[PDB]
Amino acid sequence: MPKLVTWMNNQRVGELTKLANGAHTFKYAPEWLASRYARPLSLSLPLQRGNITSDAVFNFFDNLLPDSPIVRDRIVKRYHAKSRQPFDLLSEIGRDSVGAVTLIPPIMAWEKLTEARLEEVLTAYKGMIDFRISVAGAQEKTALLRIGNDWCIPKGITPTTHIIKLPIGEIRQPNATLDLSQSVDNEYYCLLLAKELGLNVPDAEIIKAGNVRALAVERFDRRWNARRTVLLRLPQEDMCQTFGLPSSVKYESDGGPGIARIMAFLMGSSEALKDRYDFMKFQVFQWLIGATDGHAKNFSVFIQAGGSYRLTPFYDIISAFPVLGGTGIHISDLKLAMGLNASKGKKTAIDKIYPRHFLATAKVLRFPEVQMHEILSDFARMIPAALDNVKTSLPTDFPENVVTAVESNVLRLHGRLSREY
Ligand SMILES: Nc1ncnc2[nH]cnc12
C-alpha cells in the first residue's frame, strides 16, 4: 500500500503503508529519531528504527476515525474511498485529525463563511435502532476555524480551532424514545458546570447559523502562538491508543480499561499527582451530572518531548438526565461507564452510589483519602451555588427543561454529599 508522509506541524515524523495480506505497518523518519526533541507518535508505538508491524499501528490509526460503521460509510461516500479501512479514510481527511498526526500524500489563510454558507456546511452532517448517549452511533463530528467573531474553513493545511457537533436528535428504540434533540445545549451546559466546579475542560459556544443550532468546542490539541501568527497542533492520544487497544473495547464491560488501570497508568505521568486527583474528581462529577459515556476514549494524554505524557482536559461531557422521563429512560437505568468499588463487587448505578463508594475506590487505588474527602466535601458546598451561577449566566433562549432536568437531578445527588460533608 502507497505512502502518506506523517507530519507533526511542520516536521516529518514518518510514513504509513499497508499490505495486501491484511497487515499494516509504519516507519519513523530517521532524521526524526535523530532529533533531540523527538517523541513517539503513540505510547503504544515506541520510538524505534525500522517499520512497525504490530497491531498497535492499525489500532492507533483506526482509533483516529469514528468507531461507528454507519458514520464511516457516510465519509467513505462523500469522499469516495476504496473501503472503510483507515488508510483510504485518512488519505482524504487526515489533514486536520485529532492530535498532531497531520497526513499528506506554505500556508496561513482561511475562508470566512456567510451566515448562509455556514448553515450550509453544518446541515451536511445529520430510523429504528445498556443505555449510552452515543447509542445511535450516528453523530458525525466536524471542525472549523474561528477568526475573531467569524466562522471560517481552514484553507490549505491550516488547522482548526473548534470541534463542531450537531444535535444527536431523538433516537427511536423498540421500547424507548431517547430524546437527545437538545444534546448541543446539554453539553454546552455541562461544560459550564464543569468549569464552575474547577474542572479542566475546554470552553464551548453555541453556533447560530440559520435554523440549525450547533456546539463549538475549543480544541485543546491546538494553540495560537504569542503573535497569533501560527496556529499550532499539539500531539495527543486517547487511552485506547496509548494501551494499543481497538476502539471496540473502549468500554470496561467490553474488556476495556477502567478507573484502576488508568489511575495506575497516570502514576507515570509528568503530572501524576495532579492527573490522578483530577481524574478521580471527574468520576465524582460524572456521577453527579449523570454522565454515562465516560469510556476509555473519553480520556486522553498530551505527548510531550521525550515521550513524557500528562492528562489532557476532559471532553464530550453530556448528561443523561435530560433523556429521563416519559417514554425515555429512568434514573434506575443510569450507569457509569467505569464502575466503582462495592461491598462485594462493583457499583455502576448512579442511583445506588454514595460518597462511601468513592472513598472505598480511593483506598484500593492508593489515592489519598484526604484527597477523596476534599473532592466530596468540595462539591457538597459548591454545587448549590455552582448551578445558580451557571444558570444566571445562560442565554435567554436556553431551554428550561434541560436546566431543570440536570439541576434537580444534580441537587438530588448533591444531597447525599451535604448530609455527610
Ligand atoms: N475540545 C477538544 N480538544 C481536543 N481534542 C478533542 N476531542 C474531543 N473534544 C476535544
Instruction: Answer yes or no: are the C-beta atoms of 44 and 243 closer than 8 Å.
Output: yes
For ligand 1, pick from 217, 231, 293, 301 the residue to mutate: most ligand atoms within 8 Å of CB. 217
Instruction: Answer yes or no: are the C-beta atoms of 260 and 360 closer than 8 Å.
Output: no
Instruction: Answer yes or no: are the C-beta atoms of 145 and 160 closer than 8 Å.
Output: yes
Instruction: Answer yes or no: are the C-beta atoms of 270 and 310 closer than 8 Å.
Output: yes
Instruction: Answer yes or no: are the C-beta atoms of 145 and 161 closer than 8 Å.
Output: yes
Q: Which atom of ligand 1 is nearest to the CA of 315?
A: 9
Which residues does residue 216 pair with via DSSP β-bridges, in sequence order? 164, 205
Residues 6+ apart with CB under 8 A from 421: 355, 373, 376, 377, 380, 381
Residues 6+ apart with CB under 8 A from 373: 359, 421
Number of domains in the chain: 1
Please give the grid coordinates belonging to residue 61.
490509526
CA distances from 216 to 25, 166, 203, 208 (A): 35, 9, 9, 10
Classify 128 as helix, strand or coil: coil
For residue 315, how far is its CA from the centre of ligand 1 (angstroms)? 6
Using a 6 Å CB cutoff, which residues line ligand 1? 98, 163, 202, 217-221, 315-316
For residue 206, how far is its CA from the centre of ligand 1 (angstroms)? 16
Residue nearest to atom 2 of ligand 1 (CA): 219
Q: Which atom of ligand 1 is nearest to the CA of 217?
A: 1
Residues 6+ apart with CB under 8 A from 399: 182, 185
Element (H, E) at 120: helix 115-122
For residue 252, how far is its CA from the centre of ligand 1 (angstroms)? 22
Polymer length of the chain: 421
For residue 110, how far is its CA from the centre of ligand 1 (angstroms)? 21
Block residue for cell numbers 485529532: 98
Q: Which atom of ligand 1 is nearest to the CA of 219?
A: 3
For ligand 1, pick from 200, 218, 219, 297 the residue to mutate: most ligand atoms within 8 Å of CB. 219
Residue 67 corresponds to which amino acid?
Answer: D
Pairing state between β 169-172 and 4-8? unpaired
For ligand 1, pick from 163, 190, 240, 302 the residue to mutate: most ligand atoms within 8 Å of CB. 163
Residue numbers belonging to the annotated binding site for ATP: 136-141, 165, 218-220, 295-298, 315-316
Q: Which atom of ligand 1 is nearest to the CA of 218?
A: 1
Resolution in A: 2.3
For residue 356, how far is its CA from the centre of ligand 1 (angstroms)? 32
Residues 6+ apart with CB under 8 A from 313: 200, 201, 202, 220
Classify 216 as helix, strand or coil: strand
Q: Which of 96, 179, 221, 293 is catalytic?
A: 293
Residues 6+ apart with CB under 8 A from 259: 279, 280, 283, 338, 339, 340, 361, 365
Residues 6+ apart with CB under 8 A from 341: 347, 357, 360, 361, 364
Torsion region of 325: left, alpha or beta (phi above 0 gives left; psi -120 to 50 gives alpha): left
Active site residue 238: no
DSSP letter for each residue of 135-155: TT-----EEEEEETTEEEEEE
Largest CA distance in the chain: 63
For residue 313, how far is its CA from the centre of ligand 1 (angstroms)? 8
Domain encompassing residue 378 = 1-421
Element (H, E) at 303: strand 300-304
| E runs forming strands in 148-240 | 150-155, 162-165, 169-172, 177-180, 204-209, 212-218, 222-224, 231-233, 236-238
Please give the grid coordinates belonging to residue 339.
464502575
Residue nearest to atom 9 of ligand 1 (CA): 315
